[PDB]
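Duplicate of earlier report; Thioredoxin input re-posted below.
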Amino acid sequence: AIVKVTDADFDSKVESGVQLVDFWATWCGTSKMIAPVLEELAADYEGKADILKLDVDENPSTAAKYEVMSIPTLIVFKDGQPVDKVVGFQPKENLAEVLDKHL
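Output:
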């Protein structure tokens, strides 16, 4: 459902259209809390937007490149450029609202 992405293939994965990138970490309970919400979101947009995951401990470059300081952080990409940032826990509704704002 949700495709993993790393420093190595970020640029090729996030390059065209809309992607919602979830910057998470295994030591953060809040990331674990939104995981299921994103799996359901990814299904609702099974062809409009891609939902990716990036583990910040294994990919500090990318996390650093977009000034990701606190997590979870969710960034919406439009044709390779970040256009929206969401910090903390958010219910499916609030996230869907943000995606529709760019589709």
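Residues 41 and 55 are 19 Å apart (CA to CA).

Merging into the original ticket.
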